Amino acid sequence: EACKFLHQERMDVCETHLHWHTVAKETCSEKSTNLHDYGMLLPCGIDKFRGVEFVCCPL
């Protein structure tokens, strides 16, 4: 098993770095992996974003 690169965004709300970091961490965990790195997508407003791309790696 190698690491998996994933992209998740949404079109209904903008959210903070904390929210997106939380999403990435929890998504990796749901797939039996640990988040290693991530970057937000689609900066919105003054301090928010509309998605995250991230790399989940083997436990």
XYZ file of N, CA and C in Angstrom:
177
model
N 0.866 -1.214 0.000
C 0.000 0.000 0.000
C 0.885 1.240 0.000
N 0.520 2.205 -0.817
C 1.204 3.486 -0.852
C 0.240 4.492 -0.229
N 0.623 5.752 -0.228
C -0.274 6.830 0.189
C -1.291 7.150 -0.914
N -2.443 7.668 -0.497
C -3.490 8.061 -1.419
C -3.705 9.571 -1.387
N -3.748 10.176 -2.571
C -4.002 11.614 -2.741
C -5.494 11.806 -3.024
N -6.131 12.697 -2.263
C -7.563 12.941 -2.360
C -7.868 14.426 -2.437
N -9.000 14.733 -3.051
C -9.446 16.114 -3.253
C -10.875 16.163 -2.747
N -11.164 17.065 -1.811
C -12.542 17.244 -1.360
C -12.886 18.734 -1.298
N -13.946 19.159 -1.975
C -14.399 20.547 -1.868
C -15.904 20.561 -1.695
N -16.452 21.731 -1.402
C -17.894 21.860 -1.357
C -18.303 23.199 -1.917
N -19.570 23.294 -2.301
C -20.047 24.489 -2.979
C -21.123 25.226 -2.202
N -21.431 24.752 -0.993
C -22.498 25.326 -0.186
C -22.031 26.290 0.906
N -20.762 26.223 1.286
C -20.290 27.032 2.429
C -18.784 27.190 2.322
N -18.255 28.295 2.845
C -16.817 28.443 2.965
C -16.444 28.113 4.414
N -15.252 27.562 4.624
C -14.851 27.162 5.973
C -13.387 27.456 6.238
N -13.004 27.427 7.515
C -11.658 27.784 7.919
C -10.679 26.628 7.724
N -9.405 26.965 7.826
C -8.304 26.010 7.808
C -8.570 24.869 8.825
N -8.936 25.229 10.051
C -9.272 24.232 11.052
C -10.319 23.217 10.600
N -11.419 23.695 10.018
C -12.421 22.775 9.508
C -11.808 21.835 8.483
N -11.062 22.393 7.528
C -10.555 21.552 6.432
C -9.476 20.584 6.887
N -8.676 20.998 7.873
C -7.660 20.126 8.447
C -8.386 18.967 9.130
N -9.471 19.295 9.824
C -10.285 18.284 10.507
C -10.865 17.275 9.524
N -11.459 17.769 8.442
C -11.972 16.904 7.363
C -10.895 15.960 6.811
N -9.726 16.515 6.501
C -8.663 15.696 5.921
C -8.234 14.618 6.914
N -8.022 15.009 8.167
C -7.582 14.030 9.169
C -8.602 12.912 9.300
N -9.870 13.292 9.376
C -10.928 12.313 9.672
C -11.213 11.420 8.486
N -11.079 11.970 7.290
C -11.248 11.183 6.083
C -10.144 10.148 5.955
N -8.899 10.538 6.195
C -7.836 9.543 6.160
C -8.130 8.429 7.172
N -8.559 8.815 8.372
C -8.789 7.817 9.416
C -9.899 6.876 9.020
N -10.927 7.382 8.343
C -12.036 6.516 7.888
C -11.557 5.505 6.868
N -10.423 5.798 6.245
C -9.882 4.893 5.230
C -8.695 4.105 5.761
N -8.623 3.969 7.080
C -7.563 3.206 7.736
C -6.158 3.699 7.342
N -5.970 5.012 7.400
C -4.674 5.649 7.117
C -4.502 6.849 8.059
N -3.335 7.488 8.007
C -3.105 8.726 8.772
C -2.788 9.857 7.782
N -3.365 11.036 8.004
C -3.052 12.211 7.189
C -1.579 12.570 7.345
N -0.911 12.829 6.225
C 0.468 13.257 6.308
C 0.601 14.696 5.917
N -0.053 15.104 4.835
C 0.008 16.506 4.434
C -1.224 16.928 3.668
N -1.450 18.238 3.621
C -2.669 18.762 3.016
C -2.458 20.203 2.610
N -3.326 20.677 1.721
C -3.321 22.076 1.328
C -4.747 22.521 0.990
N -5.147 23.690 1.460
C -6.508 24.156 1.194
C -6.694 24.583 -0.262
N -7.948 24.692 -0.665
C -8.305 24.990 -2.049
C -9.277 26.132 -2.057
N -9.230 26.936 -3.122
C -10.333 27.857 -3.397
C -10.597 28.836 -2.261
N -9.594 29.635 -1.912
C -9.738 30.647 -0.853
C -10.976 31.512 -1.062
N -11.677 31.814 0.033
C -13.000 32.406 -0.033
C -13.066 33.434 1.091
N -13.754 34.534 0.850
C -13.873 35.527 1.903
C -12.513 36.068 2.330
N -12.387 36.491 3.588
C -11.084 36.950 4.046
C -10.210 35.875 4.684
N -10.801 34.781 5.128
C -10.000 33.792 5.848
C -10.529 32.372 5.684
N -11.328 32.143 4.653
C -11.885 30.795 4.493
C -11.517 30.171 3.145
N -12.015 28.955 2.934
C -11.619 28.104 1.795
C -12.789 27.184 1.484
N -12.797 26.636 0.277
C -13.878 25.748 -0.126
C -13.447 24.305 -0.347
N -12.195 23.961 -0.059
C -11.868 22.544 -0.073
C -10.464 22.279 0.436
N -10.048 21.028 0.311
C -8.730 20.610 0.732
C -8.262 19.444 -0.165
N -6.978 19.416 -0.517
C -6.395 18.214 -1.115
C -5.362 17.692 -0.146
N -5.264 16.378 -0.036
C -4.479 15.811 1.046
C -3.954 14.433 0.718
N -2.938 14.026 1.455
C -2.298 12.736 1.234
C -2.412 11.898 2.488
N -3.065 10.744 2.337
C -3.263 9.811 3.460
C -2.258 8.689 3.303
N -1.540 8.339 4.360
C -0.533 7.276 4.253
C -0.766 6.100 5.213
N -0.243 4.912 4.856
C -0.460 3.707 5.680
C -0.130 3.911 7.140
N -0.964 3.301 7.972
C -0.793 3.286 9.404
C 0.560 2.729 9.813
